[PDB]
Ligand binder design. Structure first.
Ligand code: HEC
Ligand code: HEC
Ligand code: HEC
Ligand code: HEC
Ligand SMILES: Cc1ccccc1N
Ligand SMILES: Cc1ccccc1N
Lengths: 108, 294, 294, 108
């Protein structure tokens, strides 16, 4: 393992403040500057129906799991150089884990 | 005997690496305190603080500016247009005691530089040499802009700072960062989704989003979008002005041109009212924490 | 066929600050994960990690040593004398995923050097070129020493590592760091009040404190002081032996000498069994996070 | 103020692990490796006797408050060069607040 179970309660908080103004968790939810995170696990890149990904995102398709998600959120541009997602990055491993536990629940 | 002249005097025996240390200390604390203002970080307010202390400049009498570091004093500190900048100083105080050799003005402006780069913005060249002056010479309250005005006010105001059309639109790209707090200025909300990462989002939202004039809970009027974004009237007037709109759409679909214009303009702002000798060293380009592998 | 010859081959395309960035990644995670082991920190176990992977060396047939970096296997991971080291391996796993190009050996050894420096210890010159051997190759268990022994055992055991009396007593100064864990080795407690700060306290406590041979909760006999500290039999041997004793007092009164000699010995230990080419880069000396202004 | 208030239950769990081995906080506490800290606030440095301070600690003779203590516990050697206290330091701001708050109580 790399990720491990943290608080899904604080991960929600991290989603409310650092993602919710972008990302929607719920099934078939509205879009935004980016995509809808429903079913983002067991998932290639750029699948999200209806959203127009810059081809930079879908030009590397590797299935999102609990681990590669961790260091994508550490620095989105060190992972996918040319993504149109503007985000500071979760530099704290705790903050990463806790948010990963929430997204595996709300994006069921 | 003619307007004030402020000579840049380099702190004794200090070079590139000394000031890189100060940058690092600040840049680290930006990453450590990520909870501030509902997880936007101290980035935006530090950018604002550097602007506000150097925005106090007046080209005619050469009073104010970022030179004197006169902001540690009481009178210009409790100024109404200054609400919320307390957090900007509480942030920098521990850095100042770790590097007590650096002048208040150099630290105030370096915080602005450090914030921009760490929020993944342009590289901003920064000169040292600012020195502290007594409370004796402290800029009176009320020489910073009003938010409830129009483009004519904006253009006219910035002539005092020696900024022309192209420059003021660039500097105003920084309102993508952070948000407006009702308890501070009487306006409320952010200007976009990403307000702690330096982008041209300001110009894109200004152009692309749909804006409505509304009352807020402070009864001031601000332009609101249904996405939850807001714009100051002065910000909105950047599209109400023909020649301002020219530059807005320019930075809109080209981020690199904006980035390079912002850098030059921001650097002039922080350096305004300061005379640099030839003896003075060429400006520093501080590397980020990623570039240092930190 | 002659004993094996392990030649240093620099990670192709990598230079000084490629590694200095790896140093920083470790120094950073050290400061972040400060909660580990009741706020002892990952520092000690990282020092232990670098020792136990270097302690597998046998001068007679040049088997084992840090060159391999074989710690990722099963047969030397479950060693009774090795319990607790996995916390060090898991600590390094994220940074090896970050730098996939670096060799396991060079990582484990660097991790130990990074720990000692960041804990305010002496500078340990480090070198690169360790390369990963086949899964086929892996040192047999029982290559590492036993804590329930006398000075004769220690002297004899360390001969295999090409270490003399002075080097041994130097390297032992590290047992000031961290503690012994009953769940791990069957021994319990620290050897001093400062166990996350590199000091000569080990020799001081070994002389000034009053030691009584007791029986812990794992039925093992250890030396305990009524100030709370403890000493492995092998450590207490250093004041039983007369030749070892004089060196203990030398380091007790002279910390800079201890630092100077630990640096030499520790570097030697990490660089046993690896033969460096002459065109190979001069040994690296990384600057601490404190020296980079953090 | 410079430093805010933190959790005294978190501060007590910072003292047992990082201080209690060298220091005692309660009134009439036995002098250990370091001096007893009872009523350290509002007292000059290298003041409480029965202990042998290095003269570097007494050298700059500072009055202990919340903000000067906080940087001394960030880097004991930077603030007082030549100090006998072997401490890595509290690099985390919250950790400093929580501990000082607890210390402010126990020194009473
Ligand atoms: C707006 C400012 C955003 C914030 C804040 C966060 N994200 Fe984002 N995200 C955004 C965009 C515009 C895109 C698409 C980029 C592209 O090139 O098309 C994304 C993408 C993602 C993805 C990948 C989706 C996929 O591969 O199909 C993930 C997994 C993701 N975003 C997650 C995520 C999280 C957890 C965030 C906060 C912690 C977050 N993003 C911030 C826009 C924005
Ligand atoms: C031993 C390993 C110590 C640890 C861990 C901590 N402290 Fe300490 N302390 C120690 C010594 C040897 C000294 C004397 C310094 C000198 O130069 O002689 C001190 C001193 C202090 C003081 C100042 C005392 C005074 O001014 O009269 C303070 C305020 C103090 N120590 C606090 C403190 C805290 C809060 C610690 C944990 C977070 C801590 N110390 C650790 C020994 C050791
Ligand atoms: C180069 C930078 C810069 C310039 C120039 C600038 N601003 Fe801003 N200002 C900021 C930033 C960044 C914030 C967000 C601060 C925060 O979120 O704490 C801000 C916030 C504000 C706020 C709200 C503060 C609060 O807490 O509610 C007002 C009002 C404001 N600016 C007015 C103006 C006006 C009027 C002008 C010019 C006509 C101007 N500013 C020019 C950077 C700048
Ligand atoms: C240069 C470093 C070094 C050398 C040489 C060394 N050790 Fe240690 N050892 C450590 C460190 C560091 C720890 C504490 C690690 C921790 O706290 O996780 C430790 C702890 C131990 C422990 C207890 C581990 C636990 O988790 O309980 C035992 C047993 C031990 N050493 C035995 C020995 C013996 C026997 C020798 C030599 C005869 C030896 N070591 C040589 C660094 C070293
Ligand atoms: C619109 C806006 C957003 C963020 C900060 C300031 C402003 N004005
Ligand atoms: C005796 C001892 C004390 C502390 C850390 C390690 C050891 N081995």
């Amino acid at each position: 393992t790399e990720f491990k179970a943290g608080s899904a309660k604080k991960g929600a908080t991290l989603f409310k403040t650092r993602c919710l103004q972008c990302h929607t968790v719920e099934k078939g939810g509205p879009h935004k500057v980016g995509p809808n995170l429903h079913g983002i696990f067991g998932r290639h890149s750029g699948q999200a129906e209806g959203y127009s990904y810059t081809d930079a995102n879908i030009k590397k398709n590797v299935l999102w799991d609990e681990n590669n998600m961790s260091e994508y959120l550490t620095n989105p541009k060190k992972y996918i150089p040319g993504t149109k997602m503007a985000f500071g990055g979760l530099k704290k491993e705790k903050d990463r884990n806790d948010l990963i536990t929430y997204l595996k629940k709300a994006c069921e | 005997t003619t307007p004030l002249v402020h000579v840049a005097s380099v702190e004794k025996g200090r070079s590139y690496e000394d000031f890189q240390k100060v940058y690092n200390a600040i840049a680290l604390k930006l990453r450590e305190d990520d909870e501030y203002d509902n997880y936007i970080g101290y980035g935006p307010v530090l950018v604002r603080l550097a602007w506000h202390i150097s925005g106090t400049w007046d080209k005619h009498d050469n009073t104010g500016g970022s030179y004197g570091g006169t902001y540690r004093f009481k009178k210009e500190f409790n100024d109404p247009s200054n609400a919320g900048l307390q957090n900007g100083f509480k942030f920098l105080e521990p850095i100042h005691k770790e590097f007590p050799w650096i002048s208040s003005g150099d630290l105030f402006s370096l915080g602005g530089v450090t914030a921009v780069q760490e929020m993944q913005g342009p590289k901003i060249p920064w000169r040292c040499g600012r020195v502290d002056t007594p409370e004796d010479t402290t800029p009176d309250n009320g020489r910073l802009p009003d938010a409830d005005k129009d483009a004519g006010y904006v253009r006219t105001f910035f002539q005092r700072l020696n900024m022309n059309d192209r420059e003021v639109v660039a500097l105003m790209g920084a309102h993508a960062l952070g948000k407006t707090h009702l308890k501070n200025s009487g306006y409320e909300g952010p200007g976009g989704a990403a307000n702690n990462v330096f982008t041209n989002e300001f110009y894109l939202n200004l152009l692309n989003e749909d804006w409505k004039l509304e009352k807020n809970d402070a009864n001031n009027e601000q332009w609101d979008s249904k996405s939850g974004y807001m714009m100051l009237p002065t910000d909105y007037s950047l599209i109400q002005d023909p020649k301002y709109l020219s530059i807005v759409k320019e930075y809109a679909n080209d981020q690199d041109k904006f980035f390079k214009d912002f850098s030059k303009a921001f650097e002039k702002l922080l350096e305004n009212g300061i005379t640099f000798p030839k003896d003075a060293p060429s400006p520093f380009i501080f590397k980020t924490l990623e570039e240092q592998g930190l």
